[PDB]
Symmetry: C2
Subunit: 244 residues, 2 copies
């Protein structure tokens, strides 16, 4: 499995900060055939970000519409992303499930729209603190994954992300994350096949920084990360280095 | 009041179609000091659209976040829009109220964020067929407007849009006018007379080359937020009706 390190900038950035951040990123000499490195800027920052990053960096957007073109003011269709050659989309991120009523059905639909339009999708899921404390981790994750997993038609083109929502004051250990990842891979196996499960990249989408990154990626079933705030720093290159 | 003609492209366009359309738009010689013309492309099309359109055309985005910067994956904050010199935002469009559960509270918060960041806001509202049939037009519009209206400090910078949802699946210009006059009365009694006479109120129902003149002529209709007709080169004729 090819390692996959992603920068989810979330709702952050200015033209000036992106200029200097991309410049520092460009200083990192890495081979894009040996690892995927994907930067997800804000929609309106996409062109700026794409032009400033060297070709070795892949790029994507943080959300995509479940609808095609039409009367959906404020939405970006998968067809539009295709026309702009936007390579990757994030689907089902915690933020969108939490604040924007995004459901498992929405996730399924968004993945389908993406795949129909040759987009690659980074799909997020994970259980809450209440769900973990009630010992429902596997129940919840199985439900969330089975909501979309049968639609994957290429196991390099869809990447899974485990978000430990429960970790609130709590922190997930690499050992705990590894076990969840192992369990996700088995769900993929039971539903899609063994070769398919061995092929699919499963990322850790909890808190990742320069300190913990190596302990996480060195776990057998953790194939990379979807990084939050640490990816807004020049030191993000040291996180990429853990995958090199 | 300065007339205000706006193109809501909604979720439509390719790089090629925008190139062709903006070029035809650029052929229209109008004075931006006398008339406001605003194009609202898809977020990822904004840079493309802004670079192709002559500066006489103002530009904006079709939605803005109710939150500031931070962990709001997929959102565009008012501060990001300001940093990019995005002049206008659409808030509360029917599509977002219908498909994305946007409430009156969301509308208020989005407006507060927009104004704090010196953005100009195009704010949409309007009643359903059921509400109209129940004779609740004024009741519904009063509640929707009062959700946000107290936030307005500069009445050049917030633009109201009446969306006749009851028609969206045929309003006469007079019927539109009557609602617009009621909206202006609501603004007068909540914000003052000077302010109500200042504020632009656009018609956001179905606007085309054939009806635009009859609509703009109405005393309390100050322009349009245009849908499908704004994806065509003949949108220039709609702009001309306000010249």
């Amino acid at each position: 499995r090819k390692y996959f390190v992603a920068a989810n900038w979330k709702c952050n950035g200015t033209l000036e900060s992106i200029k200097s951040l991309t410049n520092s990123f460009n200083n990192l000499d890495f081979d894009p055939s040996k690892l995927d490195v994907v930067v997800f800027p804000v929609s309106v920052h996409y062109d700026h970000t794409r032009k400033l990053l060297q070709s070795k960096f892949s790029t994507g957007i943080q959300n995509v519409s479940k609808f095609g073109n039409g009367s959906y003011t404020g939405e970006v269709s998968a067809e539009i992303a295709k026309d702009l050659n936007i390579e990757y989309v994030i689907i089902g991120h915690f933020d969108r499930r939490k604040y924007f009523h995004e459901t498992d059905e929405d996730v399924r639909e968004k993945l389908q729209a993406s795949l129909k339009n040759n987009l690659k999708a980074v799909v997020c899921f994970g259980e809450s603190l209440e769900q973990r404390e009630q010992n429902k981790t596997i129940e919840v994750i199985t439900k969330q994954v089975k909501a979309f997993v049968d639609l994957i038609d290429n196991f390099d083109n869809v990447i899974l992300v485990y978000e430990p929502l429960w970790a609130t004051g709590k922190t997930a250990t690499p050992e705990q994350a590894q076990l969840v990842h192992k369990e996700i891979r088995k769900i993929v196996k039971d539903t899609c096949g063994e070769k398919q499960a061995n092929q699919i990249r499963i990322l850790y989408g909890g808190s990742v920084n320069t300190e913990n990154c190596s302990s996480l990626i060195q776990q057998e079933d953790i194939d990379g990360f979807l990084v939050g705030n640490a990816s807004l720093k020049e030191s993000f290159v040291d996180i990429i280095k853990s995958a090199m």
